[PDB]
């Protein structure tokens, strides 16, 4: 009757709403040729498209929050769920809780313990008198010197398979049909607020799931100025994530050339014991070049003054205290798990623009039996590695905390953070968020129908 | 692919077609690469069933006999296609969206096909 237009259905209109879905992984279809019996994640893991597509959306402004990002939570539970699936088929070490008779190794206060103990053979009749070599961190005495496994009173224990490797490989997160992933292309982005230039991708960039504390290793570099990120900045309870401009060369080696016993606890099962150490008598150490660490510090200390004020004193110091995972730099190199003393790097005091040799070193401790992510009921034994392990990684960022003692208007001190591994994933995921596409739409037009 | 999302609705009608489309024996992660694509085909058919039961029965664009109510975004035609964008458009209709949906399935394909059956007898 009254004119004019009529409703009309449009399919595929550009309308999306912020939402959450279940994301899968992608390995680049080369990681599969890397083989070594299912390295890390990739087994049936989806091959990445040789030509990923990134579409820049013009005349668009979208508001991002990285701390509210849901992609982080899936990845955190993924690595955890990934971890258990790796330890299920492997050999369980349950009857290793046998009494340990230990003694001091032939310098640096006997960090290594030579332990003799009784063990079950293939046959169920006669036991086996054999010795092994454990770090001081893996054992605890109970009251010659008698020791025991450190994890036995807390939980059970299982050995990781020598076939698989913990080597981080690039993993692309993609979204299923009907969804989309937004990417923030600005050079300077702190993870909160509106984003001027936004592009969309089916898959996120190459992300190496490197689990580390107090140091972001093998991560993505920032653009131009170094970045400063915090959930709540003025709040001293929230950690402060830092993104580096130039990568920092770091060396961590295992200056112990070792051998594998490969003792037989059959039928069919074989445990890899740590034999005698042939080589340098040394404790594990981590190298950082004095010139390269300082330059970054000088550029970073200036960025904190875009918040804490033009002029103020910023002092750095080592970890306050807590669990070993919190107080030291924890990571994996060559299959072994290093815990490094970062106290030497964080000893400095800075002026407004400045601070008042050719190398630096960091003492590292080795622990084979670990419970990360506060896991109880499952302890993983890192198998020994033949020969000396040497590794070189990039230091791409930090986890930092601010002191609560204030004296807020006087000076501020920062210390290396730890704990939550989500922050590590938030470091790479800050520029991405998940939305679902709503294709269906209605618009008024004259066509009507016959 | 979404390129006109920032552009006006009038320009957004040209690229409409691109938006339509972009061992397996594992015990675990097999459910992770499955559960995602299964709800995808469930979400896919969810939209398509609506397209059939309405006056469309076909994809892309299709029209209907439902008259546009003035009370629903009273506007200028050039104020819609030429001056306005889809994200900005779906924002206002958000209240009347469920109302419009009813007019397509009820007022049309329920009352139209029956109307058609009566017009097909003679």
């Amino acid at each position: 009757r009254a004119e004019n237009l009529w409703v009309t259905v449009y399919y595929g209109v550009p309308v999306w709403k912020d939402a959450e879905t279940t994301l899968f992984c992608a390995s680049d279809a080369k990681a599969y040729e890397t083989e070594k019996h299912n390295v890390w994640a990739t087994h049936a893991c989806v091959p990445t498209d040789p030509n990923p597509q990134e579409i820049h959306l013009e005349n668009v402004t979208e508001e991002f929050n990285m701390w509210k990002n849901n992609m982080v939570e899936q990845m955190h539970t993924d690595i955890i769920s990934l971890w258990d699936q790796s330890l299920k088929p492997c050999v369980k070490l349950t009857p290793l809780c046998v009494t340990l008779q230990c003694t001091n190794v032939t310098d640096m206060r006997g960090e290594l313990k030579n332990c003799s103990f009784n063990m079950t053979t293939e046959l169920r009749d006669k036991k086996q008198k054999v010795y092994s070599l454990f770090y001081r961190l893996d054992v605890v005495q109970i009251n010659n010197k008698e020791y025991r496994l450190i994890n036995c009173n807390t939980s059970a224990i299982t050995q990781a398979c020598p076939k698989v490797s913990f080597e981080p490989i690039p993993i692309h997160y993609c979204a299923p049909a009907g969804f989309a992933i937004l990417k923030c292309k600005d050079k300077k982005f702190n993870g909160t607020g509106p984003c001027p230039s936004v592009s969309t991708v089916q898959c996120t960039h190459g992300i190496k799931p490197v689990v580390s504390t107090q140091l972001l290793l093998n991560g993505s570099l920032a653009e131009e100025e170094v970045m400063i990120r915090s959930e709540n900045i003025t709040n001293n309870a929230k950690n402060i994530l830092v993104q580096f401009n130039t990568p920092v060369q770091i060396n961590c080696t295992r200056p112990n050339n070792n051998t594998r016993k490969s003792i037989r606890i059959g039928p069919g099962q074989a445990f890899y014991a740590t034999g005698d150490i042939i080589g340098d008598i040394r404790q594990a150490h981590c190298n950082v070049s004095k010139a390269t660490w300082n330059e970054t510090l000088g550029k970073v200390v200036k960025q904190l003054r875009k918040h804490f004020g033009n002029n103020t004193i910023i002092r750095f110091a080592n970890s306050s205290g807590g669990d070993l995972e919190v107080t030291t730099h924890s990571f994996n190199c060559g299959g072994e798990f290093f815990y490094c003393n970062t106290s030497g790097l964080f000893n400095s005091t800075w002026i407004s623009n400045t601070s008042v040799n050719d190398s630096i070193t960091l003492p590292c401790r080795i622990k084979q039996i670990i419970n990360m992510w506060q896991r109880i009921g499952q302890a993983m034994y890192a198998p020994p590695i033949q020969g000396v392990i040497r590794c070189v990684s990039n230091i791409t960022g930090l986890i930092l905390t601010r002191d609560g003692g204030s004296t807020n208007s006087t000076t501020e001190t920062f210390r290396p953070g730890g704990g939550d591994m989500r922050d590590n994933w938030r470091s790479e995921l800050y520029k991405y968020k998940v939305v679902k596409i709503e294709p269906l739409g209605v618009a008024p037009t004259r066509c009507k129908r016959r | 692919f979404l390129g006109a999302a920032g552009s006006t609705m009038g320009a957004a009608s040209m690229t409409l077609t691109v938006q339509a489309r972009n061992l397996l024996k594992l015990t675990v992660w097999g459910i992770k690469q499955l559960q995602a694509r299964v709800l995808a085909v469930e979400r896919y058919l969810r939209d398509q069933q609506l397209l059939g039961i309405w006056g469309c029965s076909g994809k892309l664009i299709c029209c209907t006999n439902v008259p546009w109510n003035s009370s629903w975004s009273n506007r200028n035609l050039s104020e819609i296609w030429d001056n306005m964008t889809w994200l900005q458009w779906d924002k206002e209709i958000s209240n009347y969206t469920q109302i419009i949906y009813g007019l397509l399935e009820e007022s049309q394909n329920q009352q139209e096909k029956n109307e058609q059956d009566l017009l097909a007898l003679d």
Partner: antibody
Amino acid sequence: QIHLVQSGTEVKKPGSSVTVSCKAYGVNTFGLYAVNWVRQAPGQSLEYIGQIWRWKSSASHHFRGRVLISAVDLTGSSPPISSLEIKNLTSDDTAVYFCTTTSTYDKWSGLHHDGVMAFSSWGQGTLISVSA
Amino acid sequence: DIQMTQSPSTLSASIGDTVRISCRASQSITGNWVAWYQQRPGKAPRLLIYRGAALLGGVPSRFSGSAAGTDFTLTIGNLQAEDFGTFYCQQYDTYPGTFGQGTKVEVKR
């Protein structure tokens, strides 16, 4: 939670310039939160002055250019602060001024409508009495 | 530039009563962009309902909005003591936002 604490009572004479500040407590940033300045004449209704949104200052055609709204984000020593300056003060400006904010993160929220929006959080208010 | 008209400017109502305060806009507002505020004397105004029917979180269920075209109305059932004060209607439909005359809800006795 969200708390907006404004400056003290300002009594200034005509022709002078007045600056009020709004300290926004509980707000993570002004990127996800738009700030609007609204005044209320005594015994009269409310009037929209201006806003700062996505770090872009804006104001009504009444006050265009005569009103300046500036804001700095969350710092290490204090919460996010916004400031309003009014030069060429007159006797008709004696309204009570309010510092307001609104959550813009929800893109399909009914709070906002492309710059023009409602006001979720209200401040303590600041009275400006202009008299010679 | 929209102009908001409220009726009445003030009213006398008792406790338990159902109070209806209407408002009319100089033009037709669709998408229903309209807000209602409550202000107790001497205190800053608080946001109650946005988009005309949408009640804010933490607000009692006794408050109800209605929005159609040029004519808008806010309905309050079971009036109580804390509800008394001055109420305002606001349109964010177009730049800039404009408020209403205001309505003073006054105790009956």
